[PDB]
Amino acid sequence: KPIVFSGAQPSGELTIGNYMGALRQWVNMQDDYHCIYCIVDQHAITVRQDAQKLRKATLDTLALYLACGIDPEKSTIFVQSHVPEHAQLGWALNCYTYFGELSRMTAENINAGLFDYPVLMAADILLYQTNLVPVGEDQKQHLELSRDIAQRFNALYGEIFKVPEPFIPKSGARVMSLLEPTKKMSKSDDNRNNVIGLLEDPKSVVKKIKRAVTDSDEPPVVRYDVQNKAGVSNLLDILSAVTGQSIPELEKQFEGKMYGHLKGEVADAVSGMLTELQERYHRFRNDEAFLQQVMKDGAEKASAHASRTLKAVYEAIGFVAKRH
Amino acid sequence: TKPIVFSGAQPSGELTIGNYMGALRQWVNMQDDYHCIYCIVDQHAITVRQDAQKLRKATLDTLALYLACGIDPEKSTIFVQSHVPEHAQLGWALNCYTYFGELSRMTQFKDKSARYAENINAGLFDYPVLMAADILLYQTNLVPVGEDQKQHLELSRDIAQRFNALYGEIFKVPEPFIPKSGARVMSLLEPTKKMSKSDDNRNNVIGLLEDPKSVVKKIKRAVTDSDEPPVVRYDVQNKAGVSNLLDILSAVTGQSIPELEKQFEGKMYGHLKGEVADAVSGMLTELQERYHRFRNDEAFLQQVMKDGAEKASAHASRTLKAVYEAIGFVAKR
Ligand SMILES: Nc1ncnc2c1ncn2[C@@H]1O[C@H](COP(=O)(O)OC(=O)[C@@H](N)Cc2c[nH]c3ccccc23)[C@@H](O)[C@H]1O
């Protein structure tokens, strides 16, 4: 059974694009793979931020992943800082990473964490003998560095690490920005009218969907055409992703209908989906004991695996073994 | 409670009389006066590529050498860096409060990079941050080092101050403890270059575990100057070799430079080198005698490492817990 590693930032406010895209895909593959979800608080601190908001955001992210359907009895979910082995391997791998490799990632006032985090990312993955890593385009370089580091270390010391591969197949749910339908909906957009977050209430959803750009076709026609009708196509894709109705089925359903009707149904569909998600979220988020047990159990599972890899790394390097 | 002393040395190369005079001598002398913690920094050692068997052996060599010098495991905490995860943990966190420019300007990074062009690695660059973590974990007040580590120590102070300014009284701001003599012992055939523990030319070096007979021969061949008549006088600019020999002699015997200058009046470099050789040969003979008793007693070295890591972990975990609470991490259950 292959091992899958995903880093979850405790700062991102997840959108319907994040959910209906990758997360929903992965919630349904927890028996197919040994999935690991690491809430990366040690990566978060490369950007200076309020301490109390970071603690809150870590717990927010945990509860939301649980709400979306990550099962802590099937998958391993934990907070990065709870497993010392990440920092330990991070340091070790620094010594097998060229300074040039970090500088060549795509000046004097930048903090060393922002410079060095790709090595920590490599450590995060390689600790768990990870086979597969779902990456977006923005972190393809980082995965390649982790593969380069793994092969370099293995060439010196034997087959200590698995060489991880990208998880290639995409979710098959297309969710674009509401005011810029050529651009994908992304959690890190400054214009939050482009996105629908998972904790938005029905009034917020109605508002943002009514502002979503369409086209000046006369008569208005609800037909799928990414080139000529980007906005209307996005609303159709969003609706299809929520309900499971095909694009041709929806095109037939909205025959002789204006964009107001489409928008009305999209908002209703999206909010119907978010209601069950939000119910589970607030239930988990307000249960301190549950979250504490999930984190404790997750860190214990992670540590047991991570320690085995780190011991092999340390033995290969030649460090004197700790005396327990 | 007593103020805290922390210092470390790398289990790589072979420790010299420079390492001893600049650091280890002070370490031994501070043990009653302060609460002392001494570390074999194996995680720093691997910033220069090590053979795995050499690294393991050198770690244990270094531990036995600390004990041979007079570091007493009943008085001081003695441990191996990699045995305490908190070093790497705090090492990562302090990267986020250290600037790229502070690290790129470091003399050691530049010198080591020029030397090891084929392995200019991120560990070598990030070296000072892990060092700051090493110090700051133990609420350290004093850090006994040689002159060459002054720049690194200064950064650790800046990091402590910067972090404290944001979060409260989390770290002590450490102070350097650099000796008046022997802070920067120089190479015997190149006295404008500091004595290296990994020199390609062994004739530059007085190794702590080297045959005393070999060391005496090296002292006799140490370069001096062309002064006519020869005069034993301290002048680093014009008499680097003679000055370095006086510095070594002063550090061994405890005698001042004015005292030695007076003592060598009417004498030349034969007397100087004879006295340097006698003093150093005697020190190393004694040192090496103790060393083998410790080095071949694996049960004792194993127990010192166990007890030391236990003591260190108690201090380090406390500091790391406060750091993690301050920056906003969810506390581990
Ligand atoms: N020619 C010389 N003359 C006088 N002193 C010298 C000479 N060469 C070296 N030293 C001093 O020896 C100590 C150990 O040096 P290392 O290279 O092992 O090791 C080093 O240079 C440290 N980075 C190890 C370290 C890691 N973390 C720490 C925290 C606190 C103090 C020290 C450390 C040092 O005090 C060094 O200044």
Author numbering:
A (entry chain A): 3 to 108, 118 to 335
B (entry chain B): 2 to 334
Q: What did the paper state?
A:
Tryptophanyl-tRNA synthetase (TrpRS) links tryptophan to tRNATrp, thereby playing an indispensable role in protein translation. Unlike most class I aminoacyl-tRNA synthetases (AARSs), TrpRS functions as a homodimer. Each EcTrpRS subunit consists of a Rossmann fold aminoacylation domain (AD, residues 1–85, 140–183 and 299–334), a connecting polypeptide 1 domain [CP1, residues 86–139; CP1 was combined with AD in some previous studies (37)] and a C-terminal α-helical domain (CTD, residues 184–298). Therefore, TrpRS is considered an attractive drug target for developing bacterial-selective inhibitors for fighting microbial infections.
In this study, a crystal structure of full-length EcTrpRS·TrpAMP was solved at 1.80 Å resolution with R/Rfree = 18.6%/22.2%. The asymmetric unit contains two EcTrpRS subunits that form a functional homodimer. Intriguingly, two subunits of this EcTrpRS dimer adopt different conformations. A copurified tryptophanyl adenylate (TrpAMP), the intermediate product of the two-step tRNA tryptophanylation reaction, was observed to bind to one of the two active sites of EcTrpRS. The shift of these two motifs couples with an inwards rotation of the CTD around a short hinge linker located at the beginning of the CTD (residues 184–188), which makes the TrpAMP-bound subunit a closed active site cavity and a more compact overall conformation (named subClosed) compared with EcTrpRS bound with L-Trp and AMP. In contrast, the active site cavity of the other subunit of EcTrpRS dimer remains empty, and this empty subunit displays an open conformation (named subOpen) similar to that when L-Trp and AMP bind. Aligning subOpen and subClosed by superimposing their ADs shows that the anticodon binding site at the distal end of the CTD of subClosed moves ∼6.9 Å towards the active site compared with that of subOpen. Thus, this EcTrpRS dimer is in an ‘open-closed’ asymmetric conformation unique to all the reported structures of bacterial TrpRS. A short CP1 sequence (residues Gln109 to Ser114) is disordered in subOpen but forms an α-helix in TrpAMP-bound subClosed. We found that the distance between the acceptor stem binding helices of subClosed and the anticodon binding site of subOpen perfectly matches the distance between their corresponding interacting elements on tRNATrp, suggesting that tRNATrp is able to bind to EcTrpRS in this way.
